[PDB]
Design a protein around this ligand. Structure first.
Ligand SMILES: [Zn+2]
Length: 257
């Protein structure tokens, strides 16, 4: 099955998921000088004060921190969005080295990692219905660079030992995702897709201009995770990123000048 190895990586995904060669695939390179400032874009509204985190799961592709999305407790609104989008989970993509790991790139620059806060449009009732709609999901993407530690990430880093292998989970209550945001919510936005199979073209991407800084030790700990299940040969969970895909007939809009 699909993965991030030589034999099942992104270049192979189209054989099982032909939408991999679709018209609105993600990620993309954000060419900052081709993007256009759109003064009609509103400030993002990130309302996470009442967020209820539940669990952290190694799903074999990344680790997901999952939230209670049965009510409007942690929501994204505004920006390019029409309506209310509920946070369901966040996860990261990262590299084997600090110079790669992000899915989106900025003028071809790759960051060490990229955080995805995944939200679904409440008018569609459930996430499964939402992924079948062109405006079903809103994903807030945040780049990670290596420098000073991110204090609000350390609770995540410290629990990874307990979910080393695929299928493992652990309680992860009372986590505040506001601690993973940069200072500025300036962003780029474009229509795209899930970046893992089934690669559905259901996402409004909102990628923050300002990276967060994490320490070398924090991202090092991501790299100790395993793609494999317990009892199987150890395959480090590194380079779990899809490379940039062609922009095709899309425009990237900037919320800032
Ligand atoms: Zn992702």
């Amino acid at each position: 099955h699909w993965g991030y190895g030589k034999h099942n990586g992104p270049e192979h995904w189209h054989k099982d998921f032909p939408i991999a060669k679709g018209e609105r695939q993600s990620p993309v390179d954000i060419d900052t000088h081709t993007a256009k400032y759109d003064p009609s874009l509103k400030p993002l509204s990130v309302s996470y004060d009442q967020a209820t985190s539940l669990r952290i799961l190694n799903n074999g592709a990344a680790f997901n921190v999952e939230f209670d999305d049965s009510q409007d407790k942690a929501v994204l609104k505004g920006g390019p969005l029409d309506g209310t989008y509920r946070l369901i989970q966040f996860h990261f993509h990262w590299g084997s080295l600090d110079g790669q790991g992000s899915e989106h790139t900025v003028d071809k620059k790759k960051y060490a990692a990229e955080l995805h806060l995944v939200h679904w449009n409440t008018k569609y009732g459930d996430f499964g219905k939402a992924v079948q709609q062109p405006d079903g999901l809103a994903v807030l993407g945040i780049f990670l660079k290596v420098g000073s530690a991110k204090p609000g990430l350390q609770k995540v880093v410290d629990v990874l030992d307990s979910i080393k292998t695929k299928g493992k989970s652990a309680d992860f209550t009372n986590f505040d995702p506001r601690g993973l945001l940069p200072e500025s919510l300036d962003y780029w936005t474009y229509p795209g897709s899930l970046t893992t199979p089934p690669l559905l073209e259901c996402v409004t991407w909102i990628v923050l201009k300002e990276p967060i800084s994490v320490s070398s030790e924090q991202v090092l700990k991501f790299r100790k995770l395993n793609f494999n299940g317990e009892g199987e040969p150890e395959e480090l969970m590194v380079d779990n990123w899809r490379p940039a895909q062609p922009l095709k007939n899309r425009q990237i809009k900037a919320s800032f000048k």
